[PDB]
């Protein structure tokens, strides 16, 4: 569509905020609120509706994970929920294909999720697919060529560079050349035809380095890094450029949105958004109202 939406997020607790940049003029709005408090979630878009998927509410008053996918209407600026998935999904990733969404990963308490489950609008139902070979939380999760892509993450012990590949008429996953780098709660989408995997975190530092797959070569390649070391940061495509949003550095909840141009391989400041935060859900679609 139009706008980039940023759900929900952590800074000092989870957040409940929904808010809407223009690239078109700069320009931030904050759309309804959240029902529920979430950071760790992801976003989607489809048919014009906006998802927000899993997560978990890091609050005062207790920690919850969320099992929760709330839909939002940008013509009536409402959020309703829709059907709960099968299981609480904490730092989730998520991906769309055929007008279905895909919920992968993600932890409830200590259980780290290789399961994976599928969402038909049409029906307002989920149904539980092929599980991951991998327990990941963390997951950057991208959809090309209509096959979807699980990407690094967090086992429960180890934190991974390696992927891996769903073939939904085989219900069947394969791993795919692991990473150079590894990375839990980077950002991961696709542009052109490559996955791009941004940042995250390897159990050490958070990390500033971006690297692509090639479907057609199956190798990995380095590209610029971007201007700020960022984990747990969102990431969405709006006119064939990647933005990142917020994340941590280890120092700062940031509120920096960097862009990347592949064709000049730069990443430059675009804007900030209206507070420092991690763990959004991020996606595009039309303008509210
Ligand atoms: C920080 N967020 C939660 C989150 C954590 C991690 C990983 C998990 C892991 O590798 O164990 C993580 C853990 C600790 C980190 C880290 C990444 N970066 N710095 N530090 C200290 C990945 C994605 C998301 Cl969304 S949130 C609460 O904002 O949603
Ligand atoms: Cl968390």
Same mark, same amino acid.
């Given at each position: 569509?139009?706008? #980039?939406?940023?759900?929900?997020?952590?800074?000092?607790?989870?957040?409940?905020?929904?808010?809407?940049?223009?690239?078109?003029?700069?320009?931030?709005?904050?759309?309804?609120?959240?029902?529920?408090?979430?950071?760790?979630?992801?976003?989607?878009?489809?048919?014009?509706?906006?998802?927000?998927?899993?997560?978990?509410?890091?609050?005062?008053?207790?920690?919850?994970?969320?099992?929760?996918?709330?839909?939002?209407?940008?013509?009536?600026?409402?959020?309703?929920?829709?059907?709960?998935?099968?299981?609480?999904?904490?730092?989730?990733?998520?991906?769309?294909?055929?007008?279905?969404?895909?919920?992968?990963?993600?932890?409830?308490?200590?259980?780290?999720?290789?399961?994976?489950?599928?969402?038909?609008?049409?029906?307002?139902?989920?149904?539980?697919?092929?599980?991951?070979?991998?327990?990941? #939380?963390?997951?950057?999760?991208?959809?090309?060529?209509?096959?979807?892509?699980?990407? *690094? *993450?967090? &086992?429960?012990?180890?934190?991974?560079?390696?992927?891996?590949?769903?073939?939904?008429?085989?219900?069947?996953?394969?791993? #795919?050349?692991?990473?150079?780098?590894?990375?839990?709660?980077?950002?991961?989408?696709?542009?052109?035809?490559?996955?791009?995997?941004?940042?995250?975190?390897?159990?050490? &530092?958070?990390?500033?380095?971006?690297?692509?797959?090639?479907?057609?070569?199956?190798?990995?390649?380095?590209?610029?890094?971007?201007?700020?070391?960022?984990?747990?940061?969102?990431?969405?495509?709006?006119?064939?450029?990647?933005?990142?949003?917020?994340?941590?550095? *280890?120092?700062?909840?940031?509120?920096?949105?960097?862009?990347?141009?592949?064709?000049?391989?730069?990443?430059?400041?675009?804007?900030?958004?209206?507070?420092?935060?991690? *763990?959004?859900?991020?996606?595009?679609?039309?303008?509210?109202?």
């Amino acid at each position: 569509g139009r706008l #980039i939406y940023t759900a929900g997020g952590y800074f000092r607790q989870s957040l409940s905020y929904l808010e809407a940049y223009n690239p078109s003029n700069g320009s931030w709005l904050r759309l309804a609120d959240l029902q529920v408090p979430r950071s760790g979630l992801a976003g989607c878009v489809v048919g014009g509706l906006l998802y927000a998927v899993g997560g978990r509410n890091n609050s005062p008053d207790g920690n919850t994970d969320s099992s929760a996918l709330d839909c939002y209407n940008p013509m009536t600026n409402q959020w309703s929920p829709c059907a709960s998935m099968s299981v609480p999904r904490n730092r989730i990733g998520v991906g769309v294909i055929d007008g279905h969404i895909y919920a992968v990963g993600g932890s409830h308490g200590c259980i780290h999720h290789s399961s994976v489950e599928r969402y038909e609008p049409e029906r307002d139902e989920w149904h539980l697919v092929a599980p991951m070979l991998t327990r990941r #939380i963390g997951v950057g999760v991208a959809v090309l060529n209509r096959l979807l892509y699980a990407v *690094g *993450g967090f &086992d429960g012990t180890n934190r991974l560079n390696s992927a891996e590949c769903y073939y939904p008429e085989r219900n069947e996953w394969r791993m #795919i050349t692991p990473m150079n780098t590894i990375r839990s709660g980077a950002g991961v989408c696709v542009l052109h035809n490559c996955i791009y995997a941004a940042g995250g975190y390897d159990g050490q &530092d958070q990390l500033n380095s971006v690297e692509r797959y090639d479907v057609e070569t199956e190798t990995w390649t380095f590209v610029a890094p971007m201007r700020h070391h960022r984990s747990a940061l969102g990431i969405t495509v709006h006119q064939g450029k990647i933005y990142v949003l917020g994340g941590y550095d *280890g120092h700062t909840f940031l509120d920096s949105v960097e862009c990347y141009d592949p064709d000049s391989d730069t990443w430059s400041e675009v804007t900030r958004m209206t507070s420092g935060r991690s *763990g959004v859900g991020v996606a595009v679609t039309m303008e509210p109202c």
